[PDB]
Each structure stands twice: as C-alpha cells, then as structure tokens.
Design a protein around this ligand. Structure first.
Ligand SMILES: *[C@@H]1O[C@H](CO)[C@@H](O[C@@H]2O[C@H](CO)[C@@H](O[C@@H]3O[C@H](CO)[C@@H](O)[C@H](O)[C@H]3NC(C)=O)[C@H](O)[C@H]2NC(C)=O)[C@H](O)[C@H]1NC(C)=O
Ligand SMILES: *[C@@H]1O[C@H](CO)[C@@H](O[C@@H]2O[C@H](CO)[C@@H](O)[C@H](O)[C@H]2NC(C)=O)[C@H](O)[C@H]1NC(C)=O
Ligand SMILES: *[C@@H]1O[C@H](CO)[C@@H](O[C@@H]2O[C@H](CO)[C@@H](O)[C@H](O)[C@H]2NC(C)=O)[C@H](O)[C@H]1NC(C)=O
Ligand SMILES: [Ca+2]
Lengths: 19, 415
C-alpha cells in the first residue's frame, strides 16, 4: 500500500547513493 | 535395420563380410605400356615351348594392362590382368598396395595370376594407414636366404602372429591361372576361440594390404638368340586380387559407406561418430562412449540443455554423483540461465512462471528496490528480493506492518 517515498530521505550524508 | 530391434531400442550391429578389395584402386610399383613395349607369352606342349608376342600399350585401351584390372569384375572367359614391366628380377620388388583408409578385420587375401606365380613373395598389412608394415605371410623356395625366416615354422601360442614362410604355392608351373591365397586364421591355435582371443583380434585388424613380389621364375634353358624375347617373357601379372573381411565399427554400424570426402567410413549409428564409430556425436555427451556389447547397446545419449545451450561437454564428477545416469554439462548457456542442464535462473534473475522452463523468456530480471532491499539477488523462484529490516514486498518497496518510513536511506523502515 504506502510505497517508499524517495523525496523524503535526507541524502546530505550518503551523497552518492541518491537515485 | 539390424542396429535396433523389433521395438525402437538399439542393439549391437556389425557390418557384412565382403571383398573389401572389389572395385578399389590398387597402387602399383610397375605397369607396362609407358612407353609401350613388347612382351611374350610362353606355353609348353611336352618337348616344345611355344611363344606368342604382343605389345603392351598403356595409351591404347585394347592393349593396356592397368591396375584397375586387379579389382574389376572377374569373368572367367574375359579375364583382365594387370601386368608389370618385363623382367624386374632382383632385388627389384614390385608391389600391389591396397589402402582402405579405415580399420578392417581381414579374413583372407587372394591372388590369381596370368603369369607364372612368383618364386618369392610376401603379404603385408599396415595397422597405421601408410606408416608401418608388418608381415602376414611369406612364400618362397628360399625362406632363410630371401626373407630371413625358417621354412614352415610351426605356429604356436608363444607367438600366434608368426609370419610363416613356405615353399607351398611357389611353383613356376601353372604358367597362368596360378592361385596364391593367404587366410589370416589358417593355422592359428586360438582360431576356434577367435571371439575371445585378443591376440587374433589384433592379428586380423588392418588398414592396408601390401603384396610384394620379390623374385621371379625363369626357364632352365633361356636360349641365346631368345635373349630379347626370353627377357620379354618374364613378368608378374595378376587377374584378380581380393581381400575378404569386414569393417571394424564398434557395434555401432551395419554399413560402411564412402562419404563427403569419398573416403570409406562407418555409416555410424546409436548417436556415435567418427570413422570407427569410437566416439559420440555432437550434443550426445551425457554418458561416456563404449563398444556396443552382446548384452548392451551403449548408445551414447543426448545431453539436456533445456533448449538454452548449443553445445555440451561430459563431466565425470556430475556423472558419478547421479547413479551413473547423467553427466552432460551445457556450455555458454544462453538467455540468462545457468547450470549443468540450464534448469535454473542466472543469479540476479528469477523464473517467470507460467512461461515454461524451456522458453526464451523463462527468467525475468530481478530488479530490487535500490534502497529498500539489501541485495540485488532475488529468490530464483518467487523473485523476492532480500529485504531490509521492516521492509516487505517482492521488490522490497514498502515498510511492513508495524513500520513507518525513515529519513535515512540505510535503515529506511523503523517502527
Ligand atoms: C570384357 O571384354 C569386353 C568384350 O568382350 C570388353 O569391351 C568393352 O565393352 C564396353 C561395353 O560394356 C565398351 O563401352 C562402349 O563402347 C564405347 C566406349 O568407348 C562406346 O561405343 C559406348 O559409349 C560404350 N557404352 C555405352 C553404354 O554406350 C568398351 O569400350 C569396350 N572395350 C574396352 C573397355 O576396352 C571389356 O573391356 C571387358 N570388361 C568389362 C566389360 O568389364
Ligand atoms: C600406342 O597408343 C595408341 C594405340 O593404343 C596409338 O596411338 C593412336 O593411334 C594413331 C595411329 O594408329 C595415332 O595417330 C594417334 O596418335 C593415337 N591416338 C588416337 C588415334 O586417338 C599408338 O600408335 C601406339 N603406339 C605405338 C608406338 O605402337
Ligand atoms: C626389395 O625389397 C626388399 C625386402 O624384401 C628390400 O629389403 C631391404 O634390403 C636390405 C638388404 O639389401 C635390408 O638390410 C633392409 O632391412 C630391407 N628393407 C625393407 C623395407 O625391405 C630391398 O632394398 C628392396 N630393393 C629394392 C631395389 O627395392
Ligand atoms: Ca580382373
């Protein structure tokens, strides 16, 4: 039902994994 | 078809015994007519010897005497003889060599002469195509002097392959139509027991047959004015050369046949291959090759690659781990399948069921959620990616019951 929101993640650390 | 029974199932088959020489080109060291030259036929009636003379002319078929006449059809009232050049006495050796290019079991060798027979001659086999020559039999009036063998040496268990020499069948006398005829098992102690005699199994096996005429008879007079014509009376000539036997195919053929290369080869069956039928045909390597036996056909079987691999290879480990049933290993296994028989999906793919195992699109790609699942590799069946803590779904793209999303990509479901 509620899928994973990609926008919600804070990527400031782990800069490189962002899809 | 003797190679399978009344039902479908294979059985040991052996080809037929034949004149292996018939119609074959025999290679000869000598043939009159190039250039053309006179020969004389000598006959005797009691006190007198009569002599007719003739031209050997190679370039004229009505006066030629080529090798083809050794293996042609022998009509007893239209005889055709190959004829050697005149007076090749000693040490001159004149030879008829029959190369079968294929292993045969030889049972006899027969010659029929249109001249007086040789004083001394030898039959040889080769087991290795051209290369080496071994003796089957000698014929001479001087065995020790001519061939360094003793006269009528008795054949014995100790050496059952003994090339005997003998003064039998050496008489100048039948001035034509003389018949020499070697039989391979004649004399041999274990011939009665031949099919259980490895010594004799070898003995009869040969690829080639050489016949060497080493010295020729002359008359007790040989007149002085007869010098040219007496010289022109001495030659070797044969009307019919036979080699009885059968092809050696290893229980996997009932026929031998000339092929693509017009070279003699087994018409090879039971999914076997090669000229002797001694190995397996492409894509038939699930069990290792064998001579078909009395009890068992030993047809080598078709390896299974679930319609994914073009080639396959035998492996003993796999073969041994099954109860000696299957050992085929498919290769460069296409369409994102892998394995022995290409029966399961390549790591990081999973089987699109419904679409059957054999189909080109029977493995769909894995495609895990790039932050939800821990790993790229799904389950081969069900395609379930390996989900992180508090993630579920085949793609691992939703938190579980109990879990909310997080702000961190590392641990993205939390409680
Ligand atoms: C045994 O002796 C025969 C006579 O007793 C020899 O004669 C040969 O007969 C052949 C027929 O089978 C001839 O062929 C024909 O003749 C010429 C070819 O040059 C032409 O008129 C024809 O085209 C041909 N055949 C056909 C079907 O149209 C041979 O020419 C002739 N002579 C030879 C070969 O010297 C045989 O030689 C001999 N042995 C056999 C037949 O095996
Ligand atoms: C040997 O070869 C042939 C006969 O077998 C002869 O040559 C042919 O015959 C004529 C004359 O008889 C020649 O003119 C031709 O050159 C030949 N070919 C033909 C007709 O096609 C030849 O005479 C014989 N040789 C000897 C030396 O007797
Ligand atoms: C004729 O054939 C004989 C065989 O009977 C040849 O024999 C060779 O002869 C010498 C002695 O002269 C031996 O030392 C060799 O071992 C023999 N070898 C072979 C393969 O037979 C002989 O040379 C021949 N001669 C000619 C001119 O052909
Ligand atoms: Ca003949």
């Amino acid at each position: 039902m509620p899928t994973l929101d990609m926008a919600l993640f804070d990527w400031t650390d782990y800069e490189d994994l962002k899809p | 078809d003797p190679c399978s029974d009344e039902n479908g199932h294979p059985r040991r088959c052996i080809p037929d015994f034949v004149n292996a020489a018939f119609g074959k080109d025999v290679r000869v060291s000598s043939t009159c007519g190039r250039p053309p030259a006179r020969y004389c036929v000598v006959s005797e009636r009691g006190e007198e010897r009569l002599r007719s003379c003739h031209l050997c002319n190679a370039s004229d078929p009505k006066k030629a005497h080529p090798p083809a006449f050794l293996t042609d059809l022998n009509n007893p009232h239209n005889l055709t003889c190959w004829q050697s050049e005149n007076y090749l006495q000693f040490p001159h050796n004149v030879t008829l060599t029959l190369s079968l290019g294929k292993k045969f079991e030889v049972t006899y060798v027969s010659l029929q002469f249109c001249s007086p027979r040789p004083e001394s001659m030898a039959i040889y086999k080769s087991m290795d195509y051209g290369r080496t020559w071994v003796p089957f039999q000698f014929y001479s009036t001087q065995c020790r002097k001519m061939y360094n063998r003793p006269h009528r040496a008795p054949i014995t268990k100790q050496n059952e392959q003994e090339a005997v020499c003998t003064d039998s069948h050496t008489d100048m006398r039948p001035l034509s139509g003389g018949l020499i005829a070697f039989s391979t098992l004649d004399g041999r102690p274990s011939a009665h027991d031949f099919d259980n005699s490895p010594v004799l199994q070898d003995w009869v096996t040969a690829t080639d047959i050489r016949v060497a005429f080493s010295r020729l008879h002359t008359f007790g007079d040989e007149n002085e004015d007869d010098s040219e014509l007496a010289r022109d009376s001495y030659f070797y000539a044969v009307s019919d050369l036979q080699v009885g036997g059968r092809c050696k195919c290893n229980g996997h053929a009932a026929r031998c046949v000339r092929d693509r290369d017009d070279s003699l080869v087994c018409d090879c069956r039971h999914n076997t291959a090669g000229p002797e039928c001694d190995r397996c045909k492409p894509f038939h390597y699930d069990r290792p090759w064998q001579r078909a036996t009395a009890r068992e056909a030993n047809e080598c079987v078709a390896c299974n690659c679930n319609l994914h691999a073009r080639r396959c290879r035998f492996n003993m480990e796999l073969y041994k781990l099954s109860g000696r049933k299957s050992g085929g290993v498919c290769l460069n296994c296409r369409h994102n399948t892998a394995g022995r028989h290409c029966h399961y999906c390549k790591e990081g793919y999973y089987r699109d069921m419904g679409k059957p195992i054999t189909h080109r699109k029977a493995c769909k790609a894995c495609d895990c959620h790039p932050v939800g699942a821990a790993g790229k590799t799904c389950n081969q069946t069900t395609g379930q990616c390996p989900c992180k803590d508090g993630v579920t779904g085949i793609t691992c793209n939703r938190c579980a019951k109990g879990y909310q999303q997080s702000r961190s990509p590392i641990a993205p479901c939390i409680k």
